[PDB]
Design an enzyme around this catalytic site. Sequence first.
Site, PDB file in Angstrom:
ATOM      1  N   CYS A  61      40.764  51.203  33.196  1.00 24.02           N
ATOM      2  CA  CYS A  61      40.707  50.397  34.412  1.00 24.02           C
ATOM      3  C   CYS A  61      40.588  48.930  34.029  1.00 24.02           C
ATOM      4  CB  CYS A  61      39.519  50.846  35.247  1.00 24.02           C
ATOM      5  SG  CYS A  61      39.608  52.669  35.515  1.00 24.02           S
ATOM      6  N   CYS A 116      47.662  44.616  35.449  1.00 25.26           N
ATOM      7  CA  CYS A 116      47.265  45.921  35.928  1.00 25.26           C
ATOM      8  C   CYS A 116      47.842  46.987  35.008  1.00 25.26           C
ATOM      9  CB  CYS A 116      47.877  46.036  37.340  1.00 25.26           C
ATOM     10  SG  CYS A 116      47.342  47.473  38.272  1.00 25.26           S
TER      11      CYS A 116
END
Lengths: 246, 245
Positions: free
Chosen positions: B75, B193
């Site tokens: 993450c 991301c």
Amino acid sequence: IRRIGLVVPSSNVTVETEMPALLSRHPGAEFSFHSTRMRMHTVSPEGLAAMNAQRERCVLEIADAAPEVILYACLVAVMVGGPGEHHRVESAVAEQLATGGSQALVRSSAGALVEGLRALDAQRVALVTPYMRPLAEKVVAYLEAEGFTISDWRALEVADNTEVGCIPGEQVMAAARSLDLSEVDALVISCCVQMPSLPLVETAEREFGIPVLSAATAGAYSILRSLDLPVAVPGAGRLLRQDSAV
Amino acid sequence: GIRRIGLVVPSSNVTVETEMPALLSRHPGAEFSFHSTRMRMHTVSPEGLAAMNAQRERCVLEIADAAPEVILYACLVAVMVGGPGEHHRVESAVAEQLATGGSQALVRSSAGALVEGLRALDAQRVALVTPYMRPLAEKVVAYLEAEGFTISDWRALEVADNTEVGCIPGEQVMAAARSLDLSEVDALVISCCVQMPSLPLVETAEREFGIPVLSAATAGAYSILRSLDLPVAVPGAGRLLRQDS
Ligand SMILES: [Ca+2]
């Protein structure tokens, strides 16, 4: 002889004293010290502010001495800027030297302290500091942004820089003994460049049974690592004798 | 011979598992195996983010089980939303979980690897591309600013659904790059991301822009190599991944 450049608050007297002293116990290297001063007297967000504004002039002065490393010894002036300000200060200084072909390496007392703590594999940390609380709280925020947990801290609340230089070791030891260190990886027994602690570092380590360090010993660490010298300096806690042990 | 990498991914994340082996099977000196556990999340919002993060400990036992050689917490925004220096804390928590129960697997988070890789490149001035909502985009910016980087420009695509993010064309990403001013920039983070696809675009980006480009995926690739003490020499993706050659 390695030339170390020191950028110090004008009223500071403890860095120019402790750095030479412990770095003189080095096994094979010899050093010389060269200062430039930024005016400060009262350690406040305003005192810090007016000081920090003098950096550009100081860097220019100290680069004239062509030192191998420059240590920006203003610890609280950096941290009052908050998360990662040592990066942007060290960077600004590097940038400035790059304008004039200086070859000097850069370290700061704020950076070095993080480096010493990481060299210790420290996660849980306690500190003793002479700052006023609002400032002590800023030092703590800054460290937690670097991934440390500040379990406990003490702020002796001594705002006049000159008086900070005169804090007796016993006042500093007592605060350290009032701390709960049971779950603590390292004790920063002096989180301030100004507050004396050197003769204390080794003894505190022996008593507390956890690594102890200060802004100064950690500065000495950073300096040594930056010039690729053995960190094998006796009587300044485990940080400083890492290569004698492994 | 084959090095067991661990992945702790958001349940709806699809890209990590595509790109991480894609680039990493391009190594001439080592082969890799990938294995994952899933923390449920569908909406990339402070709400879903937190409820995903609360699943960490279950996830980490699950994967310990396989005994990876390095466990990538996958993450980025889920780490950076929790404040300056959050990756240190998360890595420390995982690491401490592992030792508590046997596993010696090294721990890395995308957020971490991002910084490590920016730093290996000698970047100070950084430009970035993100899929996020602006409020999270700004958090990622603030996080990087606390790591001592100057974020001189950024784009925010504003796509809250994690599934929408993955279905994200190279039409869009490449476009944003060209949007940003890079005449002061040292490195492009072409995708911030691990969910937003970026890779086919990346090695070209460099050759296009004259500058070191990267992404979380590639940066995590770099970090993994370094952690495994393998030479960093992976083709088709930036000097960062081929700096030992
Ligand atoms: Ca940091």
